[PDB]
A paper describes a structure:
Colony collapse disorder (CCD) is a multi‐faceted syndrome decimating bee populations worldwide, and a group of viruses of the widely distributed Dicistroviridae family have been identified as a causing agent of CCD. This family of viruses employs non‐coding RNA sequences, called internal ribosomal entry sites (IRESs), to precisely exploit the host machinery for viral protein production. The IAPV‐IRES found in the intergenic region of the IAPV virus belongs to the well‐characterized type IV family of viral IRESs. Using cryo‐EM, we comprehensively characterized how the intergenic IRES of IAPV, a virus of the Dicistrovirideae family and a causing agent of the colony collapse disorder (CCD), binds and manipulates ribosomes to redirect them toward the production of viral proteins.
We identified two classes of particles showing robust density for IAPV‐IRES in the context of a binary interaction with the 40S. All elements of the IAPV‐IRES included in the produced construct were identified in the maps except SL‐VI, which proved disordered—no density could be assigned to it even in low‐pass filtered maps. The L1.1 region in the context of a binary interaction with the 40S shows a high degree of mobility and can only be modeled in maps filtered to 4 Å. The IAPV‐IRES inserts two elements of its structure between the head and the body of the 40S subunit, effectively restricting the dynamics of the 40S head to specific ranges of conformations. SL‐IV is deeply inserted in the interface of head and body, in the surroundings of the E site, clamped by stacking interactions established with residue A6498 of the IRES and tyrosine 72 from uS7 and arginine 135 from uS11. In this conformation, the IAPV‐IRES fully blocks all three tRNA binding sites of the 40S subunit, interfering with early steps of canonical initiation (Aylett & Ban, 2017). The two classes present a conformation of the IAPV‐IRES nearly identical (r.m.s.d. = 1.12 Å between the two IRES conformations) but in displaced position with respect to the 40S body. The IAPV‐IRES seems to follow the movement of the 40S head, pivoting around the anchored PKI and SL‐IV which are exceptionally stabilized by ribosomal elements from both head and body, effectively “clamping” the IRES to the 40S subunit.
Numbering used by the authors:
A (entry chain D): 58 to 278
B (entry chain b): 2 to 99
C (entry chain B): 2 to 218
D (entry chain Y): 2 to 72
E (entry chain n): 1 to 25
F (entry chain W): 1 to 83
G (entry chain S): 2 to 133
H (entry chain X): 2 to 130
The structure:
Amino acid sequence: KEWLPVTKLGRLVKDMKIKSLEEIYLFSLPIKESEIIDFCLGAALKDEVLKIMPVQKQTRAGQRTRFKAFVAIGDYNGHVGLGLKCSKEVATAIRGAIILAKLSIVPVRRGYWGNKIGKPHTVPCKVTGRCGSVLVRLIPAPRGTGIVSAPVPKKLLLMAGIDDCYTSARGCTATLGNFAKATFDAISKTYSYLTPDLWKETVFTKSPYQEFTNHLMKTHT
Amino acid sequence: TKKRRNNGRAKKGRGHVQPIRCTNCACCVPKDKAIKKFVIRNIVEAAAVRDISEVSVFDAYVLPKLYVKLHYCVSCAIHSKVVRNRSREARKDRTPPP
Amino acid sequence: SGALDVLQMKEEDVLKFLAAGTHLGGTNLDFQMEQYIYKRKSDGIYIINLKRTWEKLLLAARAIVAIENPADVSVISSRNTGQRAVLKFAAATGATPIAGRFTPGTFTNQIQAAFREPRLLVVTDPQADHQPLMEASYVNLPTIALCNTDSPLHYVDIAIPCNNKGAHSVGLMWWMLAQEVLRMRGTISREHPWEVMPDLYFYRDPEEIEKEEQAAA
Amino acid sequence: GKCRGLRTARKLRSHRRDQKWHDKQYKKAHLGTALKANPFGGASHAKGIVLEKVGVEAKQPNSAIRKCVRV
Amino acid sequence: MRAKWRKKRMRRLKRKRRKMRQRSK
Amino acid sequence: MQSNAGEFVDLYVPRKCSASNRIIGAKDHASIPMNVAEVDKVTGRFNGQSKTYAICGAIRRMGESDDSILRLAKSHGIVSQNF
Amino acid sequence: GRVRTKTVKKAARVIIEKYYTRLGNDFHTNKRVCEEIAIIPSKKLRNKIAGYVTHLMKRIQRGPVRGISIKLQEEERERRDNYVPEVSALDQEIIEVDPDTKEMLKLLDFGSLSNLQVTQPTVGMNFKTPRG
Amino acid sequence: VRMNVLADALKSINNAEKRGKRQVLIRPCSKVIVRFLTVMMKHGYIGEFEIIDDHRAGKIVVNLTGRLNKCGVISPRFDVQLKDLEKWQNNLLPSRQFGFIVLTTSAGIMDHEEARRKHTGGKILGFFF
RNA sequence: CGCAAGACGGACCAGAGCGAAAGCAUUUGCCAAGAAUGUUUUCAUUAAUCAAGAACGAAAGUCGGAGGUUCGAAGACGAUCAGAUACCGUCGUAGUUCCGACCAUAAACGAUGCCGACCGGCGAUGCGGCGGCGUUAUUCCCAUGACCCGCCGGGCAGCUUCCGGGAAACCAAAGUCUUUGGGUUCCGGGGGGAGUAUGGUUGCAAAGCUGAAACUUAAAGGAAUUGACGGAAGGGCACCACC
């Protein structure tokens, strides 16, 4: 029940030193502890098991069925994650994919169609994402448009907290894994698309490895 | 699927090469394609280099060798165990084996 | 290192480079190392620019001093040569050594025993010590490297151009870097030729260890 | 398209016109042969007179007798 | 049925149609 | 990133490569943030402040990160202009 | 076939690692040490373990062993590694030097040192390994 | 052969910025390339450039930031009414908030946003964002 | 030991060269031709790609000559086999060769149209040019060859890299593509039916070029993974294997 943190970044987050996964996402830190993402977005993170998929390794004495569980996770406020865990039975796969979904979560940059007033509703600009044959293009839309998409990328984009969007999809979208991984990859690239807004050169702040080096020596090894 | 980059053979900028005949079989094989193996070989191995040198009219007469450039049909070669199948990693090794 | 006199290259330091052989490159040249070079020789061997060597040495040492906790600097050698040199460097500077076999997943697998999570790597050879350079690219780790003229600069953020091959050169280069991080930290002064001797860091071939085991009497 | 000339309207139209015939759904509708050989003559429904009641053996897998009517 | 022999069969079948068509001429 | 009222609404402003200006995404684990310490121009000791540099993983995988820190430390005065 | 298994070796490792001070090169005492410091549930295992301990303790009396960790580390690696001669090998009175590194030091502050004997340059560029 | 010189230019500085170059040689030169570049400069996408005068067509050397995501030519130079210019920036720019279609009007080679306030259409040259 | 005839050009012979492709290997001469490099020569947009039209186009095959060594469709046997009009063997006509005339097709393959730009690294090789310590020959210096160490262009390639792409295998092109527009030709549209029928056209013929429909069908197919399997290769074990 109790979390005893193993990694350096996990130690800081439990000891209250860094308090926003925004600050983690700024220095591009690997997030390997599961409870970090369960700590900052915990009372909002909602789960939808997109698909249970029976795969089969043929052996000497008949097929060996394992189950992939594709789980999209996200608050409805600008964070999604897309976890895929393959295990012996579906209970273990779903649980393991929830954990991998958490560990995957990215921030979504969201912007405006035309009139920059109120809160951002749509994708800032046209972003494309790929996986295998699948290509998921996102285009911004005006307010009240909703997500104009298939049931799979709808479940992600809604969880991303993107209220409005026009999608396109090419290639075998029937392969839900690739189709969910493409639309997740497309979303991911919103804070990896250089807009004019981010032309002002960065005032390089201090890593929580550097900022809180003095705490980390006495608290853990 | 394309197994070899150099489609088995060793022509790049030709279009046509003269064929040779595999020695074991006798099948028309392109020269570059064929598994060519040069064999220098004593006319007697070990059992007779003792006996013949003893009955050598001469004193300190070196023996001749037998120089034959063998060509091989790809089937010719693999059945005769001159070349073995190799793993897709070890196919790319072109160094002649030690 | 730059437009400054206190951190300028001194005379006994040049004699320590020229004696070690840190000005002898390989016969080959990496495209990324063409700036850390003066000219070839006859015999084809490329000569390193020892000024540029010293500029990278101080830049490296500057980066090493900028890390507040010293105990999270990983000082890596796998190849025989640097094994001793890095093991002494960590004694001098309070860093953590990895001498010899680097377990894949030390920086990556958080459950392994050797799970050290550093803030900066130092590497005796990018080619030989390629695994930690690759695992630096999975947990954000700046890398310092002791790069020969034919050392691949993939995942190397400061390349110190040296003769990382020869045993004298490596021991010297580590000693220079160990003495400079201490001088910049303020553990030694710059007016005293430092008490620790660069022979202390040299790899000793077990022909020369069994030369010592005999020639005491 | 593989000719982006500004003065290439006819090559692009005349190519598309020629390559529409290699479609099935088009070739079918845009020739008499599909509309002639159609037993209904392009009509939705058709009144006919039963001349025998016919058992047709179902396909390979499943195996019933399908009761059809020769018209 | 190798595709070369399918062609040869169909080629000799076509040759026996310029025999039954060669009688009305 | 700012609304009709002028409010910064995006939930974090990203870092971006000190070499080629490429914004450094939340899951770029190849990306290298370095602190280069500065020195008292007669003593030769760590002052307490540094010239911090940040490279995107992409240029670091290319292997050009070396030359890009070397430029950023030359135009910063840390390194000799002569070189 | 007399190869020892992991449960014998791993035990013997950890026993030496924690209790190097009590052990020696005598089986029948090492056997009796293993009784005291560890619950080995079987006499045969107890001997197998003690037996590999003794074999390792001989290998410890020689040079260092790979998969082991003792207190000292180990008086030839901590103490002897502080070996330093009278004067260093970098203290050459006459440093051999080619004209081309003289040409680069001439384009530094170090135009002329006293202890640099520049050789007559090497003739006939002939260094590459013949192909095939 | 070389036919659209503005294509060679914009593809070469696109290739170069993807590679992360600080500057790029574009080794034929036209007055149309120079007007296009000055438009990309006024909006700060590329850095202050330089036209090398040999006694043939010039060579330009273009300082680059990491702001230019992509520049590109539309070939052929389609004619654009003020009606149609919405449907181009609709399908040819990544948003309404940024990106600029360059189109040669009679007034001069310039962005789509000035072609609105001057109230002059013309031929689409390219685009950049 | 000779003589005669007709094929063929071993070894040298290469991931080497040349050619638009097909193709091209004894010596020597003649004949025109050609890329590449070199150029402070000239013309000055003459260009790129291409319905029509055209040249060349392996082998087999056709017609009329010449020649017929070898090999060898058909055929005659001799074996194997249950059969064996086949694989194996001995003969063997057309053919294989040369000349003139057709034919115009090949997995005619890099299964990858041509032109142009840009984007990595590396050591090789072939051609030309340029530069540089040294060794060797024409010895009597030169200057030319032969090596040696570089650079430049053009070519056939190779290795390597998270450039990037791709379903992948893989590709410095198959990249610079949803961030989709450099120019242009040909050409594909689920599998069969079918490169069939039919009409035209070319051909002495064999056939080639153009070329459907009815009808039938839920797949056919690509790449890769795991397994089983092999009359594939290698390693290992066992007196339920052998010695």
